[PDB]
Amino acid sequence: SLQFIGLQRRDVVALVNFLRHLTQKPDVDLEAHPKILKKCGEKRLHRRTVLFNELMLWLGYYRELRFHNPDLSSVLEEFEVRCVAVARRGYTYPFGDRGKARDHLAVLDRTEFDTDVRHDAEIVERALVSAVILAKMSVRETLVTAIGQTEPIAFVHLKDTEVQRIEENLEGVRRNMFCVKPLDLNLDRHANTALVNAVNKLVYTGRLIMNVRRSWEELERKCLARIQERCKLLVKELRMCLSFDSNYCRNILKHAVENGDSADTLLELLIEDFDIYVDSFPQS
Amino acid sequence: THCQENSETVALCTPRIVIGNLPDGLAPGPFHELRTWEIMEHMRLRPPP
Amino acid sequence: DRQPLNPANIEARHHGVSDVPRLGAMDADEPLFVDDYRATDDEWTLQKV
Amino acid sequence: KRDEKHRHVVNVVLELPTEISEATHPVLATMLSKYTRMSSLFNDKCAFKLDLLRMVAVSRTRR
C-alpha cells in the first residue's frame, strides 16, 4: 500500500480510494482529474516531499491501471469469427477481376491473433484495410491507386446517423477503456449486400479493438514519462546532501522505470524499506 | 527524377550546379583526385606546401 | 540452468540498496541477477570486435 | 525482547567485535531493524556480513 509523507489521513484515504475506484471513473486520465494531483501537497509541503508524494501517486496509478489492463478475448474471438464470415462471403461474390479479390481474400484468411497485446492492433489494422478494399470493390466504387497511399478505415454505405452513433460510442471507449460497449448491432438487412454488412460489422469490431489498445498505450507511456521525470527531479534534489538516508534513497531511485515490471520493482523497493530514508524528507 | 505531388507522380528536372554531382559511376572519386592534382600542377603547387 | 530464461526468471540488482536475499543466492543458478542497463547495438558489436 | 533479537543478529550472525555495537555504530543501528526481520538466511552469515560492508560503503560514498 502507498505510503505518502506529510498528508493528512483524510487526504491519503481519499487518494487511495480514488485509485481504488479508477475503473468506475469516466475520463480516466489523471491529467483530467486535477482534484487528485494537488492532493499530493502542492504549496503545502516542501519540494522534496511533494515530489515524493506525486511520484508515489503516479506509480500507484500505473500499477492499478496495469491491473485493470483489459482482456479482449471475447471481442478478439468475435473479430476472428467476423473475419471468417467476411472471407466466406467474399469468395462467392462475382468480382469482375478476381485476382486482386483473391489476394485480399488470402490476407483476410491468414489473420490470426498471436496472444500478445501489442501485435493484435496492427494485425487488425491490416485485416481491416483488406476488408474495406474488398467492400469498396463490391459496390464498384473508386479506390486509392496513388502510390504510398492506403485505403482509409471507413464504413461502406452506412447511414449518417449510424456512423455518428458508432463514432460517439468509440469515443466513449476512448474516454474509459474498461467499460466495453460493443453493442452496435443495428444493421438492417434490406439495404446493402451481405458482404458490405459483414465488412461493416468487422470494421466496427476492429476499430473498437484498435481504439482500446491505442488508449491503453498512450496512458502507459504518459505514466512512464511522468514517473521518469519525477525520479530525475527527486534524484537531482537528494544529491545535494551526502548522508546514509539520502544516498539510500538516491540508490533506490537510480533504477530505470521505463517498463511496467521495473515500475513494480521500484514501487515495492520504495515501500519495503521506507523507514530507512524517510528522515531525509522534511515533514514540517 | 520521378516524384510525388499531392497523390500524383510528377517529373522533376534540376541542374547539376557543380561537377561533383555526377555519379560515382560516371565520374569516380579517383578521377576527381587526379583532376585536382592536375589543377595543382597548373598552379605550380604540384609539390604542395 | 536448464530451460530458456523467461522474463520473470531475470531479476534486477539493487546497487546501494540492502540486498541480503541476492547475496545469499550468489551461488544459485536460475534467477540470473542482472543490471537494469542493456547494451546498445553498436557497443555490442564493439564488444565482439 | 528486541534487545535479544538484535544481540543475536550482532553476535551470532555478524560476529561483530565487542568494540562495535548497535548503540555506537549508527549504520548498524538502522540496518538492525531490517536484518531482524529476515529470520531465515541466518545460517549463511557471509551474506549479512557483505551487506553490512556495502551499507557502510553507501554511507561513506561522497557522490
Query: What is the bridge-based pairing of β-strands C33-34 and B2-5?
Result: unpaired
Tell me how far apart the alpha carbons of residues C23 and C19 are, in angstroms, rounded to a whole number.
6
What residues of chain A, 138 to 177, have a C-beta less than 8 Å from chain B? 146-149
Q: Which of A257, A266, A152 shows the shortest CA–CA distance to A207?
A: A152
CA distance C40 to A9: 46
**Residues A241, A57, A118, A262, CA torsion sign:** positive
Instruction: Map grid coordinates 504518459 to a residue.
Output: A222
**Do C15 and A250 make contact, defined as CB atoms within 8 angstroms?**
no
Method used to solve the structure: cryo-EM
Q: In whole angstroms, what separates CA A218 from the centre of its chain?
A: 6
H-run or E-run covering C11: strand C11-12
SS3 track for D1-63: CHHHHHHHHHHHHCCCCCCCCCCCCHHHHHHHHHHHHCCCCCCCHHHHHHHHHHHHHHHHCCC
- The C-alpha torsion from A126 through A127 and A132 to A138, rounded to 10°, is 130
C-alpha pair distances (Å), D11 with each of A170, C47, D19, D26: 66, 46, 12, 17
Judge contact between A130 and A113, C-beta under 8 A. Answer: no
Longest dimension (CA), chain C: 37
Which residues of chain C have a CB within 8 Å of the CB of A252?
16-17
Report in angstroms the alpha-carbon separations of A135 from A44, A86, A111, A132, A154.
Answer: 60, 10, 17, 5, 10
Is residue A1 within 8 Å of A16, Cβ to Cβ? yes
CA A121 to chain centre: 11
D26 grid coordinates: 549508527
Assess A275–D contact: CB distance below 8 Å, yes or no: yes
Task: Give the contacts of A212 (CB within 8 A, at least 6 positions apart).
Answer: A70, A72, A173, A177, A180
At a CB cut-off of 8 Å and minimum separation 6, what does A122 contact? Answer: none
Q: In this complex, does chain C touch chain A, defined as having at least 3 beta-carbon pairs under 8 Å apart?
A: yes
Spatial distance between the Cα atoms of D46 and C25, rounded to a whole number of angstroms = 11
Task: Give yes or no for C15 touching A (CB within 8 A).
Answer: yes
What cell was used for A18? Answer: 480514488
Closest residue on chain C to A252 (Cα)? C17
CA pair distance A160, A74, nearest whole angstrom: 28
Can you tell me the distance from the alpha carbon of B5 to that of A117, in angstroms, rounded to the nearest whole number? 37
| D36 within 8 A of C20, measured Cβ to Cβ | no
The closest alpha carbon to A159, from A199, A185, A187, A135, belongs to A187
To which residue does cell 521506507 refer?
Answer: A274
The amino acid that residue A146 corresponds to is A
Residue linked to cell 468506475: A24
B3 touches chain A (CB under 8 A): no
Residue pair A206/A129 in contact by the 8 Å Cβ criterion: no
Single out the residue of A4, A142, A137, A125 nearest to residue A60, CA to CA: A4
H helix or E strand, kind and range, residue A16: helix A9-20
Number of H helices, E strands in chain D: 3, 0
Residues 6+ away with beta carbon under 8 Å from D57: none
Would the CB atoms of A251 and D59 count as touching at under 8 Å? no
Q: Which of chain B's residues have a Cβ under 8 Å away from the Cβ of A147?
A: 4, 9
Half-sphere exposure in the Cβ direction for D53 (13 Å, CA) = 7
Closest Cα of chain A to B2: distance in Å? Answer: 12
**Residue A172 CB contacts under 8 Å (≥ 6 apart), including other chains:** A181
Distance CA C19, CA A269 (A): 11
Burial A119-132 (b: 16+ CB within 10 A, else e): ebbebbeebbbbbb
User: What gap in Å lies between CA D34 and CA D31, rounded to an integer?
Assistant: 5
Q: Is A248 on the interface with C (CB under 8 A)?
A: yes
How far apart CA C46 and CA A158 sit, in angstroms, is: 58
- For residue C12, the surrounding DSSP H or E stretch is strand C11-12
DSSP string, B1-49: -EEEETTEEEE------SGGGS-TTTS-HHHHHHHHHHHHHHTT-SS--
* C-alpha distance from C40 to closest chain D C-alpha (Å): 26
Helix/strand number for chain A, H first, E second: 11, 0
Could you tell me how many residues make up chain A?
284
Contact (Cβ atoms closer than 8 angstroms) between residue A226 and residue A51: no
End-to-end CA distance of chain C: 28
C17 and A252 within 8 Å at the Cβ level: the answer is yes
Strands B8-11 and C33-34: unpaired
List the single residue in A247, A273, A276 with the smallest CB-CB distance to D61: A247
Query: Going along A126-230, which residue ranges are E strands?
Result: none
Residues C9 and C3: their CA atoms lie apart, in Å, by 10
Q: What letter would DSSP give residue D20? A: S
Residue C10 grid cell = 531475470
CA separation for the pair A248, A242 (Å, rounded): 10
Question: With breaks defined as C to next N over 2.5 Å, after which residues does chain D break?
Answer: none
